[PDB]
């Protein structure tokens, strides 16, 4: 389970800027913090973990000052290093079964430039040389360094471990996939691309293949894992066959939420009927 | 106005201890610095306080910091006449070059000399070039000199005079008038003067 | 560098003509993160569109999720229209259930 | 470390005034504050290195410039009464402060005057009563209050037994353009004053107009000058 705090900061000019961030434990969103807002918002009932109303308030205020501070710093760094500017900051820890490890990566205009490593900021190999001075300035602050180290070394792992027992439930929830078939013209003359749509499954790991009874098709392509709004997943597995060779193919879906009982969709009664309920005029088709 | 200093002006007997208060609301508060400003010259650093509950010492100077209360005090042990300056509290909002300094309006510390034997007297002095002044002098620094409640008459403030040759010190104030009929006897009767004050006749 | 967005339109449940459903528009791989996403039924905007908060991948590029409540037909069209600094004209990608 | 020039300056409304800072410390960050009673220092303009310049909290009326690591000028294009202050530049990464510049901007140069200086001889009564003798110096009728006062004995500046008021005082407290006066005391032993061989000189340095200042008025030009009065000892 990888826990990441993700910060988005935009600087349009000297006077206008905003910063927004969100927090992910695994693929679940736990917090959100908008520029419009004073405080960090929970997106789960258990987002506080095992910290107490006092402990969290202190950690919150800590962040509240940071956000104001980070803002003025960068504006000043820019006056030093003679807009528009985008900064991205990713920090957290990947929990091992032990034990763990931490990270605080910073990106500038889309590129990965700085990390916090050991007791200070350093520029990542192959970084621009103008950043040397800003890092020299930023490393002269003992106070930030101290608080950042505690955050990474002690505070972050002790927090996440709180979430993993508090969100025991929502993390180990199971959701059954629902699949359906369809096909589209291939890019090749007289071939057909067949689609097996799989939707609404959690957790993420899943097995989808095109079969011919025994032999699973080697031309089976797995698409990207796309998200649903309700924290479930979407995948499609496609197969290119020469038109008139669809007959005898089957989509097979293996996922932990079913147990032993797969979804085996055959190309041809069940199929025919579902293809009738999704008919349309085919504008526009790509 | 995030850094406020207390008290506004302080007055101590030469040899005694003096306490100076500083309250700030600057956020964040990385460090707090005390400066001395010798009237006419620039600022000069005495001490810095960093930790959440810090306490430093620069010989006779000693300072304390309490961030939880956002408060610092500067103590001076065995004040000297040299200590007559303005003391300025400055707070820094970062631990690096990017920080802004936040200055207090300062505390004005006047260190009055001790005078074990006064000789209160007012003398008339005549101009070396062919006009006179009145010199009020050798009173103790328990006396204050009021400024003239008269149009044409001028009176100065207390001034401390150190003859380091003999380690003898005295206070003095000059009054003069454009007007002719100006006796020295009634020149400082704007102030409360000691019962022993020596008024020599000029006639 | 100024990365250009990719648009993906897909439904939450198997599409059944005349049955309540949700349409997802996932926009990815763009830069800078300022973006404007509208969803259109028959070329006109939709009154209620829910957005997710924005994030980015391990490759630092931004993604976001727009979704709307809809019931499909044989005749009705649905598209996702994106405005962004890397495009001179706004891109429009129509829903294609067969994809 | 940190040098400033000039130390005293007198301007007219609408004149140009450059204030020069210089540092041999090799720092990057240079600052310009101004000091006024009840305020604490206030940032006008600051700098991160050669060729860079920045607005402080109160930069209105001021352009700054940093030609090199070493020098940081504050420029006043159109001087105004409001800009009467004491200015400090500082160098460093936090800071180290210069000895300050005192500037006055006046509505008109018409009322600027040098001091008249006079020494008053020690009272006989004081000699008999205390065995000590106090000379008293008196600088009068000068405007504005930019004066430095020293005591000189036998051709060498003394500090022992010297006094000067902290403040000048207005010769007419009610009037706003009033002239100023500053007193100073020098006390020595009777027998030291009773020696005719001894020489006493009061010196007042006054800051006024410079080389390139237009003066069309009738009276003598109230330039930056030294005015002195003097006395010798006597057995009587
Ligand atoms: C971080 C992992 C821990 C996570 C566990 C908690 C989970 C709870 C979830 C809540 C959601 C959180 C929102 C997500 C936020 C993203 C996390 C990123 C962490 C950032 C580290 C925070 C730094 C903390 C120290 C700080 O506030 N510094 C402040 C205040 O410091 C001042 O005040 C202090 C006391 O208040 C001290 O006195 C200090 O000496 C003084 O200077 C200081 O001003 C820092 O300089 C601010 C910047 C810090 C980040 C640097 C960014 C990298 C540099 C970019 C380079 C490119 C620029 C070139 C153009
Ligand atoms: C947090 O952990 C880091 C890494 O162990 C410590 O920081 C330094 O680690 C580097 C190697 O990356 C060493 O070379 C340094 O000497 C370490 N610093 C110190 C102070 O020894 C860091 O000390 C830890 N922080 C805390 C407070 O626990
Ligand atoms: C700063 O930039 C944004 C453009 O994204 C604009 O809305 C704002 O008005 C700008 N401010 C200035 C200084 O013009
Ligand atoms: C972001 O928030 C700050 C206050 O925390 C505000 O000053 C700034 O104007 C905001 N930017 C906008 C309008 O997006």
DSSP string computed for A141-184? -HHHHHHHHHIIIIIHHHHHHHHHHHSHHHHS--B--EEEEEEE
Question: Of A172, A192, A212, at which residue does a domain stop?
Answer: A172
Look-up: residue for tokens 């669809």? Answer: A246
Answer yes or no: do A88 and A217 share one domain: no
May I ask the CATH architecture of the domain B114-203?
A: Sandwich (2.60)
Q: Distance between CA atoms of D47 and B195, rounded to whole angstroms?
A: 61
Residue owning the nearest CA to atom 38 of ligand 1:
B30
Which of A152, A172, A192 finishes a domain? A172
Coil vs helix vs strand at B76: strand
Strand, helix or coil at A64? helix
Contact between A79 and D93 using a beta-carbon 8 Å cutoff: no
Pairwise CB contact (< 8 Å): B28 & A69: yes
Contact A84 C54 (CB under 8 A): no
CA distances to B38, B104, C56, D97 from D89, rounded to whole Å, are 16, 17, 46, 6
Alpha carbon nearest to ligand 1 atom 40, residue? A143
Nearest to B163, CA basis, from B144, B197, B138, B193: B138
| Distance (Å) of CA C13 to CA A72, A83, A210, A278 | 47, 44, 21, 11
How is residue A57 written in tokens? Answer: 């308030």
- Establish if A63 belongs to a structural domain: yes
Compute the distance from residue A63 Cα to the ligand 1 centre, in Å.
7
What are the domain boundaries of chain C?
A: 1-99
Q: Give dist(CA A217, CA A228) in Å, integer.
A: 28
Neighbours of D172 (CB within 10 A): 11
- What is residue A218's DSSP assignment? T
CB contact under 8 A, A69 and B95: no
Q: How many whole angstroms separate alpha carbon A175 and alpha carbon D173?
A: 89
* One domain for residues A129 and A93: yes
Task: Show which of A172, A200, A227 is a domain's final residue.
Answer: A172
Report how far apart the first and last C-alpha atoms of chain D are (Å, whole number).
Answer: 51
- Distance in angstroms (rounded) separating the CA atoms of residues B97 and B41: 25
CATH topology of domain D1-107: Immunoglobulin-like (2.60.40)
Query: Is there a contact between D48 and A79 if contact means CB atoms under 8 Å apart?
Result: yes
Q: Where are the domains of chain D?
A: 1-107, 108-236
Encoded tokens for B102: 């936040």
Residues A65 and A20 in one domain: yes
For CA atoms D22, D24, D30, D34, the dihedral sign is negative
Q: For residues B175 and B191, what is the distance between their CA atoms, to the nearest angstrom?
A: 12
- Domain limits, chain B: 1-113, 114-203
CATH ID of B1-113, from 2.60.40.10, 3.40.640.10, 3.20.20.70, 3.90.1300.10:
2.60.40.10
Residue pair B32/B24 in contact by the 8 Å Cβ criterion: yes
Q: Is the CB of A35 under 6 A from ligand 4?
A: yes
Cα–Cα distance, D88 to D75 (Å, whole number) = 13
Contact present, A41 and A26 (Cβ < 8 Å)? no
CATH number at residue A178: 2.60.40.10
- C-alpha angle C5/C11/C12, rounded to 5°? 115
Question: How far apart are alpha carbons B101 and B26 in whole angstroms?
Answer: 10
Structural domain total, chain A: 2
Query: D173: which 2 tokens?
Result: 């407290």
- The CATH code of domain C1-99 reads 2.60.40.10
Query: Which of A27, A30, A175 is closest to C12 using CA atoms?
Result: A175
HSE-up (13 A, CA, CB side) for residue D210: 8
Nearest residue on chain B to A62, judged by CA atoms?
A: B28
The residue of A90, A106, A280 whose CB has the most chain C CBs within 10 angstroms, and thus the best one to mutate to test that interface, is A280
Separation between Cα atoms, residue A68 and residue A50, nearest integer Å: 27
Q: Which of A149, A155, A157 to mutate to test the pocket of ligand 2 (most atoms within 8 A of CB)?
A: A149
Establish whether the linkage from the previous residue to D216 is cis, with ω within 30° of 0.
Answer: no
Query: Rounded to an integer, what is the distance from CA D36 to the centroid of its chain?
Result: 16
Rounded distance from Cα A62 to ligand 1 centre (Å): 9
Q: Strands of C91-94's sheet, edge to edge? A: C44-45, C36-41, C78-83, C91-94
A15 and A139 assigned to the same domain: yes
Same fold yes or no, B1-113 and B114-203 = yes
Nearest to D163 among B97, B106, B160 (CB): B160
- Evaluate whether A195 touches A286 at the Cβ level (below 8 Å): no
Residues in B touching D39 (Cβ below 8 Å):
103, 105
- Got the DSSP string for B1-45? --EEEE-SEEEEETTS-EEEEEEE--SS--EEEEEEE-TTS-EEE
Which has the closest alpha carbon to D94: D35, D25, D39?
A: D25
Question: What is the DSSP code string of chain D?
Answer: -EEEE-SEEEEETT--EEEEEEESS--S-EEEEEE-TTT--EEEEEESSTT--EE-S--TT-EEE--SSSB-EEEESS--GGG-EEEEEEES---EE---EEEEEES-GGG-BPPEEEEEEPPHHHHHHHSEEEEEEEEEEEBSS-EEEEEEETTEEE-TTEEE-SS-EESSSSSTT--EEEEEEEEEEHHHHT-TT-EEEEEEEE--B-TT----SSSPP-BSEEEEEEEE----
Residue A55 Cα distances to A46, A183, B63, angstroms: 15, 55, 32
User: Per the structure block, which two tokens stand in for A114?
Assistant: 């700085």
- Return the residue whose CA atom lies nearest to atom 13 of ligand 4: A18
Distances (CA, A) of A51 to A92, A147, A283, B30: 17, 18, 54, 27
Within 8 A of B158 by CB-CB distance, chain D residues are none
Q: Which residue range is the domain that position A158 belongs to?
A: 1-172
Top CATH class, D108-236: mainly beta
* A184 and A59 co-located in one domain: no
Residue A200, CA distances (Å) to A229, B68, D113 in order: 10, 52, 92
DSSP B198: B
Query: Which ligand 3 atom is the nearest neighbour of the CA of A14?
Result: 13
- φ/ψ bin of C18: left (φ > 0), alpha (ψ from -120 to 50), beta (otherwise): left
User: What residues form DSSP beta bridges with D138?
Assistant: D118, D183
Cβ contacts (< 8 Å) between C94 and chain A: which residues? 283-284, 286
**Cβ neighbours of A90 in C, within 8 Å:** 56
Tokens representing residue A100 in the block: 């763990």
Specify the experimental method: X-ray
CA distance C13 to B94: 54
The residues near D58 (Cβ < 8 Å, ≥ 6 apart) are D34, D42, D43, D44
| D52/A82 Cβ within 8 A | yes
Ligand 2 pocket mutation, candidates A91, A100, A102, A119, criterion most atoms within 8 A of CB:
A119
- Alpha carbon B181 to chain centroid distance? 35
In order of C65, C69, C88, C93, the CA distances from C7 in angstroms are 10, 18, 16, 7
């Amino acid at each position: 389970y990888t826990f990441r705090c993700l910060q988005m900061s935009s600087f349009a000019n000297r006077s206008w800027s905003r910063t927004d961030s969100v927090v992910w434990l695994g693929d679940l969103q736990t917090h959100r913090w908008s520029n419009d807002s004073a405080t960090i918002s929970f997106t789960k009932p258990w987002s506080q973990g095992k910290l107490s109303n006092q402990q969290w308030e202190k950690l919150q205020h800590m962040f509240q000052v940071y956000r104001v501070s980070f803002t003025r710093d960068i504006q000043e760094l820019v006056k030093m290093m003679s807009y528009p500017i985008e900064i991205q900051l990713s920090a957290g820890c990947e929990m091992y079964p032990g034990a763990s490890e931490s990270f605080l990566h910073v990106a500038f205009q889309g590129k990965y430039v700085v990390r916090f490593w050991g007791t200070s900021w350093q520029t990542v190999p192959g970084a621009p040389s103008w950043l040397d001075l800003p890092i020299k300035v930023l490393n002269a602050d003992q106070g930030t360094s101290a608080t950042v180290q505690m955050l990474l070394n002690d505070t972050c792992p002790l927090f996440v471990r709180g979430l993993l027992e508090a969100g025991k439930s929502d993390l180990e929830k199971q959701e059954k996939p629902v699949a359906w078939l369809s096909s589209v013209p291939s890019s090749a003359h007289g071939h057909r691309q067949l689609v097996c749509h799989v939707s609404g499954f959690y957790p993420k790991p899943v097995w989808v293949m095109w079969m011919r009874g025994d032999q699973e098709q080697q031309g089976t392509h797995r698409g990207d894992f796309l998200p649903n709004a309700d924290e479930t997943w979407y995948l499609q597995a496609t197969l290119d066959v020469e038109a008139g060779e669809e007959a005898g193919l089957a989509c097979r879906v293996k996922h932990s939420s079913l147990g032993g009982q797969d979804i085996i969709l055959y190309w041809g009664l069940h199929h025919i009927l579902d293809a009738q309920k999704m008919v349309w005029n085919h504008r526009h088709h790509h | 106005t995030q850094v406020e200093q207390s008290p506004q002006s302080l007055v101590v007997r030469q040899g005694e201890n003096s306490v100076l208060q500083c309250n700030y609301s600057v956020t964040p508060d990385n460090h707090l610095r005390w400066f001395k400003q010798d009237t006419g010259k620039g600022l000069v650093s005495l001490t810095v306080l960093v930790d959440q509950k810090d306490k430093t010492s620069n010989g006779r100077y000693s300072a304390t910091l309490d961030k939880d209360a956002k408060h610092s005090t500067l103590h001076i042990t065995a004040t000297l006449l040299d200590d007559t300056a303005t003391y300025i509290c400055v707070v820094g909002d970062r631990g690096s070059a990017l920080g802004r300094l936040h200055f207090g309006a300062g505390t004005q510390l006047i260190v009055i000399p001790d005078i074990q034997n006064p000789d209160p007297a007012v003398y008339q002095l005549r101009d070396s070039k062919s006009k006179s002044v009145c010199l009020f002098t050798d009173f103790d620094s328990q006396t204050n000199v009021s400024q003239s409640k008269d149009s044409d008459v001028y009176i100065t403030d207390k001034c401390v005079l150190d003859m380091r040759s003999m380690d003898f010190k005295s206070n003095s104030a000059v009054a003069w008038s454009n007007k002719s009929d100006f006796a020295c006897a009634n020149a400082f009767n704007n102030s409360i003067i000691p019962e022993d004050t020596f008024f020599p006749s000029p006639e | 560098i100024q990365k250009t967005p990719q648009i993906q339109v897909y439904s939450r449940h198997p599409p059944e003509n005349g049955k309540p459903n949700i349409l997802n528009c996932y926009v990815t791989q763009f830069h800078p993160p300022h973006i404007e996403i509208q969803m259109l039924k028959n070329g006109k905007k939709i009154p209620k569109v829910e957005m997710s908060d924005m994030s980015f991948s391990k490759d630092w590029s931004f993604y976001i999720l727009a979704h709307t409540e809809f019931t499909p037909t044989e005749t009705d069209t649905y598209a996702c229209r994106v405005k962004h600094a890397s495009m001179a004209e706004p891109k429009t990608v129509y829903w294609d259930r067969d994809m | 470390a940190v040098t400033q020039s000039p130390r005293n300056k007198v301007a007219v409304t609408g004149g140009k005034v450059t204030l020069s800072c210089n540092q041999t410390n090799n720092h990057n960050n240079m600052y310009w504050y101004r000091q006024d009673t009840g305020h604490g220092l206030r940032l006008i303009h600051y700098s991160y290195g050669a060729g860079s310049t920045e607005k402080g909290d109160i930069p209105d009326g001021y352009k700054a410039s940093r030609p090199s690591q070493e020098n940081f000028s504050l420029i006043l294009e159109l001087a105004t009464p409001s800009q009467t202050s004491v200015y400090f530049c500082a160098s460093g990464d936090a800071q180290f402060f210069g000895p300050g510049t005192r500037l006055t901007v006046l509505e008109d140069l018409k009322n600027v005057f040098p001091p008249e200086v006079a020494v008053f001889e020690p009272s006989e009564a004081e000699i008999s009563h205390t065995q000590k003798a106090t000379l008293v110096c008196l600088a009068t009728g000068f405007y504005p209050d930019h004066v430095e006062l020293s005591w000189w004995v036998n051709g060498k500046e003394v500090h022992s037994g010297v006094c000067t008021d902290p403040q000048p005082l207005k010769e007419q407290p009610a009037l706003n353009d009033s002239r100023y006066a500053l007193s100073s005391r020098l006390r020595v032993s009777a027998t030291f004053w009773q020696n005719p061989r001894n020489h006493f000189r009061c010196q007042v340095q006054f800051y006024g107009l410079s080389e390139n200042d237009e003066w069309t008025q009738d009276r003598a030009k109230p330039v930056t000058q030294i005015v002195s009065a003097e006395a010798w000892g006597r057995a009587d």
